[PDB]
Write a protein that binds this ligand. Structure first.
Ligand SMILES: Cn1cc(-c2ccncc2)c(C(=O)Nc2cc(-c3ccccn3)nn2C)n1
Ligand SMILES: [Mg+2]
Ligand SMILES: [Zn+2]
Length: 313
């Protein structure tokens, strides 16, 4: 019980910042996650033996794809850590537990293809789960891993606390389906502006946790420019593989996914920042003021893509 994880000095300080990059040393990522659980949640939240076994089974069930990989999982959990740590008193003990675990598991067994490609391919998962197809799959993989002998990190919760955390994780993982973000953010916007927003209303907390999940999921746009720009290569490597597979089904893909239209990337990033990322971090910052550094970093990155278009890089 007296066994802490400690990080080297630079990581001990930088892990607390929203723009932290977890680095290229994969074998330190589990340790980084346990560190974040210990500080976010407590040294008693989980049996270390079970938590380590859970982490390693999760890692094994992420695939070797350019972006939707184990690094993404840990990165998304770090952004949740930073939100939780800057909003100490707003979240219950169950929510802190559930949300880091949800972030770690939110893309389990991703193949690097969108919901839309699965439906056009007529993948068996598109028959089992008609909407949020990959996200319902990620939640299914999460429940499966939790039921492996030795992996039930929630075993010391009471029966009703166990049902609550699995429900926090289900809604948090479904919320990472970007198709659902637009409605959720619009509704949070109206509620914040007419002043009906009420963090004691469960259906409102669910909406706010959804937005936190979108914010954490998109957090590549909130890093320092060199991280954001090199992450974009990984994201587009999957988009363009998907476009290739569309062309194999005899469907011209959208330009976002066509490797023949790489020149259009900078203008496509502008649309994405303006339509998704800025609106996401603006509402998050209106609901949770200490998450403003995410909105500031995002706007810095929009300005860098505007400089790419003006030829200044
Ligand atoms: C889910 N997600 C994460 C990112 C993202 C985040 C960070 N870096 C790169 C991409 C994106 C995205 O780019 N989205 C995105 C890119 C383009 C586009 C259109 C034409 C030509 C090139 N790109 N359209 N959209 C909607 N979507
Ligand atoms: Mg996902
Ligand atoms: Zn994700």
């Amino acid at each position: 019980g007296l066994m802490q994880f400690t990080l080297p000095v630079r990581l001990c300080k930088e892990i607390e910042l929203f723009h932290f990059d977890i680095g290229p040393f994969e074998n330190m990522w589990p340790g980084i996650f346990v560190y974040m659980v210990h500080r976010s949640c407590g040294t008693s939240c989980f049996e270390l033996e079970k938590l380590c076994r859970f982490i390693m089974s999760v890692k094994k069930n992420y695939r070797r794809v350019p972006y939707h990989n184990w690094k993404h999982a840990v990165t998304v959990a770090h952004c949740m850590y930073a939100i939780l740590q800057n909003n100490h008193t707003l979240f219950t003990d169950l929510e802190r537990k559930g949300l880091l675990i949800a972030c770690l598991c939110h893309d389990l067994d991703h193949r690097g293809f969108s919901n839309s490609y699965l439906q056009k391919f007529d993948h068996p998962l598109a028959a089992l789960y008609s909407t949020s197809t990959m996200e319902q799959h990620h939640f299914s993989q999460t429940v499966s891993i939790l039921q492996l002998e030795g992996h039930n990190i929630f075993s010391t919760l009471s029966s009703s606390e166990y049902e609550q955390v699995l429900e926090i994780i289900r809604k948090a993982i479904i919320a990472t389906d970007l198709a659902l973000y637009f409605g959720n953010r619009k509704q949070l916007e109206e509620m914040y502006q007419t002043g009906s927003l009420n963090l004691n209303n469960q259906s409102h907390r669910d909406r706010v946790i959804g937005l936190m999940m979108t914010a954490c999921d998109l957090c590549s746009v909130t890093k320092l420019w060199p991280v954001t720009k090199l992450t974009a290569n990984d994201i587009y490597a999957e988009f363009w593989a998907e476009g290739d597979e569309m062309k194999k089904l005899g469907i011209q893909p959208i330009p976002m996914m066509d490797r023949d239209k790489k020149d259009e990337v900078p203008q496509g990033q502008l649309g994405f920042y303006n339509a998704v990322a800025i609106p996401c971090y603006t509402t998050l910052t209106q609901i949770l003021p200490p998450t403003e550094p995410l909105l500031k970093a995002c706007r810095d990155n929009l300005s860098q893509w505007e400089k790419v278009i003006r030829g200044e890089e």
